[PDB]
């Protein structure tokens, strides 16, 4: 009963930012989702396109694990067919989705006094992101007809802001670690099915 370390991502010491989200490929494994259900950490569990129970009875060839950290009020933007700062500019989910979204508060570990300036996101971008696209490029945004020749200043802003996390922020501005699972079916002999 070989079982891939879901605890590798769900217990990672350091997560990734929103503008640079991590992607993991899972295959040739057994999917035991009881640990996630019996986990005392998770509090939000929304599944789109697939029922929550009987998850292991129907199985696919490839499973994708994804991770980032966002604000509390900003979790609800991770949903199919939604518009917002994250969906339009940082992480756009497909309109047709087959997977579950996991998010749990992590204020104790991810927030320190004086701010946690290790988390960033993108605020200005010319055109919205196609589903499942990652943009790491950092070029000075232009908001005026006259170019500024690649130096920030008047009418040219840096494309990435910074998240400032502090222990005393509100329940909406506290860090939430989000993991989304993307099940996909292809022409393979159902390598990962479960117990």
């Amino acid at each position: 009963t070989n079982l891939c370390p879901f605890g590798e991502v769900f217990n990672a010491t350091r997560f990734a930012s929103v503008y640079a989200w991590n992607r993991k490929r899972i295959s040739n494994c057994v999917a035991d989702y009881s640990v996630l259900y019996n986990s005392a950490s998770f509090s939000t569990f929304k599944c789109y396109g697939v029922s929550p129970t009987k998850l292991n009875d129907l199985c696919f060839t490839n499973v994708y694990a994804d991770s980032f950290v966002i604000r509390g009020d900003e979790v609800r933007q991770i949903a199919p067919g939604q518009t917002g700062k994250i969906a339009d500019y940082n992480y756009k989910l497909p309109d047709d989705f087959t997977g579950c979204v996991i998010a749990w508060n992590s204020n104790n570990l991810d927030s320190k006094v004086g701010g946690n300036y290790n988390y960033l996101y993108r605020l200005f971008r010319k055109s919205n992101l196609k589903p499942f696209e990652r943009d790491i490029s950092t070029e000075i945004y232009q908001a005026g007809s006259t170019p500024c020749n690649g130096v920030e200043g008047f009418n040219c802003y840096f494309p990435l802001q910074s998240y400032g996390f502090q222990p005393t922020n509100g329940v909406g501005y506290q860090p939430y670690r989000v993991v989304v699972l993307s099940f996909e079916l292809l022409h393979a002999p159902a390598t990962v099915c479960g117990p």
């Binding site: 200005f124 908001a143 400032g164 005393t168 509100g170 329940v171 501005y173």
Partner: protein, 595 residues
């Protein structure tokens, strides 16, 4: 690509950056008020320095855009608010002089010292001179103490005030305002929607008009206090003359709350108080705040955040840390709300627990709005909202539901009248004074009153409007308005007049929705979810909409009216008329004390 679209991206940079600096500045200022230490003071100056420098850079940069090209009304207001800078438009060498006076004026007021005739001590304003004006029943003692303040501060403050008026008038000239007085009324101006627009000039001829209906209440209240003062002072008050200024109860007469002991209607009947029974059942500091939450829960307002109940100052520290004990309601931002108050087991602290918490519920309501619109509709909405919550808690009906007093207490009109006169002295006493003070300063900035006729015109208004007179003659060398905190500093005093009117407009409207039939006396808003939702549509508005729209959203009118205030005091009006019919109701401006 156009000017309108590129302006939209400017605010996003400003909003996503200003909140981070605002939290740092607010948190630093919180620590000093919570821990008075030399190291903490340095942090606030550094933190405020970054906030000040950041604000000027964006405000100067915002002036580049053209206002007319902006089409979105919400965008237009947000850009315009940042565009207004003020004194920065003047030259630095003018600016340094103007700031030099303002700090100087505070120094003389802070360094208050009046030489006592005895050499034992030289009494300062805080707190010895205040004690004389409150707990002394000697006419001669009050006279020297009251004159001493004008004798010391007025003489030094007079030469400085002459340059103060001229310098500020130049600033308003560069901003296209008529005068510095026009700026102070600029916060009440909305110009766009023809149905909802206001005028800066319309603030005048409106404060006066609503004062007309107040006068019947004031004049009737004016004479009643005279009669009771006759018993203590037989040969110093004329039967139809004006009361001496020093005898009002305070140094400036801004409140009459200290006249309750002298002019109580019924001495035998005790006043309502639950302090003696609050000690029973051993109530603690956290129970008062926890109980006062149920008032807002029953009205269907949101609960309190988990960060409120911890990390908040709900009692005096036992570690000896020096603090400022004046209660305050802080909104640090980014989702953090705290209350800092000196909680004791008294009746007053129970009432202020509802008032301070009332400010917090307003702060939560407009949290969704951008940073630049996180404020009350005008300068008078914020304090008015919290005051109406204090009114309900004072009513015995709310107190009876708690079992604090006897479950079958007997109501009598004698004690209810006893309760109204105390409230009438505070709420109604300041109304003639607040209007008079702002009326004078408005005309000084215009220039109608010459600098040589400042003092002669000052007491002429007081005799005609307020109804008081100076005990001793004064000439142009004196400067009496500077003996006030709000006048010595660059503070506007009109907020304390419109707040009272708005306070009773909200209370009357929420009572009707509560299906309360009878007197406005004991109208309780508790256990009435219908009234709560009426309130939340106005609180959540913030500064997004003009105050006329916000006002209409709760009372259905587009202007300030004094009718609800008169309806509140109507039960006292009928009883007070009978008692004042025996003597003359009014005053004689011709009569003078020194002659």
């Amino acid at each position: 690509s156009t000017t309108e679209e590129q302006a939209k991206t400017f605010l996003e940079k400003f909003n996503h950056e200003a909140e981070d600096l605002s939290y740092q500045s607010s948190l630093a200022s919180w620590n000093y008020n919570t821990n008075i230490t030399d190291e903490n003071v340095q942090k606030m100056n550094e933190a405020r320095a970054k906030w000040s420098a950041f604000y000027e850079e964006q405000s100067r940069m915002a002036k580049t855009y053209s206002l007319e090209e902006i089409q979105n009304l919400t965008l237009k207001r947000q850009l315009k608010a940042l565009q207004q800078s003020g004194t920065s438009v003047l030259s630095a060498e003018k600016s340094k002089r103007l700031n030099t006076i303002l700090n100087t004026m505070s120094t003389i007021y802070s360094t208050g010292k009046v030489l006592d005739p005895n050499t034992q001590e030289c009494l300062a304003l805080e707190p010895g001179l205040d004690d004389i004006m409150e707990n002394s029943r000697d006419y001669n003692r009050r006279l020297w103490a009251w004159e001493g303040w004008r004798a010391e501060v007025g003489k030094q403050l007079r030469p400085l005030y002459e340059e103060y008026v001229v310098l500020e008038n130049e600033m308003a000239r560069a901003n296209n305002y008529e005068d510095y007085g026009d700026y102070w009324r600029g916060d009440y101006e909305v110009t766009e929607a023809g149905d909802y627009d206001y005028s800066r000039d319309q603030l005048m001829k409106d404060v006066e008009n609503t004062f007309a209906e107040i006068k019947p209440l004031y004049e009737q209240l004016h004479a009643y206090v005279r009669a009771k003062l006759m018993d203590t002072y037989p040969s110093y008050i004329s039967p139809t003359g004006c009361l001496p200024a020093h005898l009002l109860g305070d140094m400036w007469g801004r409140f009459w709350t200290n006249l309750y002991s002298l002019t109580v209607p019924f001495k035998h009947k005790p006043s309502i108080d639950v302090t003696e029974k609050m000690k029973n059942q051993s109530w603690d500091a956290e129970r008062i705040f926890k109980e006062a939450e149920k008032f807002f829960v029953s009205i269907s307002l949101p609960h309190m955040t988990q960060g409120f109940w911890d990390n908040s100052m709900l009692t005096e520290p036992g570690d000896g840390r020096k603090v400022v004990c004046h209660p305050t309601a802080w909104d640090l931002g980014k989702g953090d709300f705290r209350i800092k108050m000196c909680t004791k087991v008294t009746m007053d602290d129970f009432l202020t627990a509802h008032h301070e918490m009332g400010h917090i519920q307003y702060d939560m309501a407009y949290a969704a709005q951008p940073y630049l619109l996180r404020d009350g509709a005008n300068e008078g909405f914020h304090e008015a909202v919290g005051e109406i919550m204090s009114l309900s808690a004072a009513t015995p009906h709310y107190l009876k539901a708690l079992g604090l007093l006897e479950p079958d207490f007997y109501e009598d009109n004698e004690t209810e009248i006893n309760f109204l006169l105390k409230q009438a002295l505070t709420i109604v006493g300041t109304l003639p004074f607040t209007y008079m003070l702002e009326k004078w300063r408005w005309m000084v900035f215009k220039g109608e009153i010459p600098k040589e006729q400042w003092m002669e015109k000052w007491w002429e208004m007081k005799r005609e409007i307020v109804g008081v007179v100076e005990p001793l003659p004064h000439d142009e060398t004196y400067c009496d308005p500077a003996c006030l905190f709000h006048v010595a500093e660059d503070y506007s005093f009109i907020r304390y007049y419109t707040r009272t009117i708005y306070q009773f407009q909200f209370h009357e409207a929420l009572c009707k929705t509560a299906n309360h039939e009878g007197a406005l006396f004991k109208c309780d808003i508790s256990n009435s979810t219908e009234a709560g939702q009426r309130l939340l549509q106005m609180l959540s508005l913030g500064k997004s909409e003009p105050w006329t729209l916000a006002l209409e959203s709760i009372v259905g009118i587009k202007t300030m009216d004094v009718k609800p205030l008169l309806n509140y005091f109507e039960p006292l009006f009928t009883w007070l008329k009978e008692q004042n019919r025996n003597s003359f109701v009014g005053w004689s401006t011709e009569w003078t004390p020194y002659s």
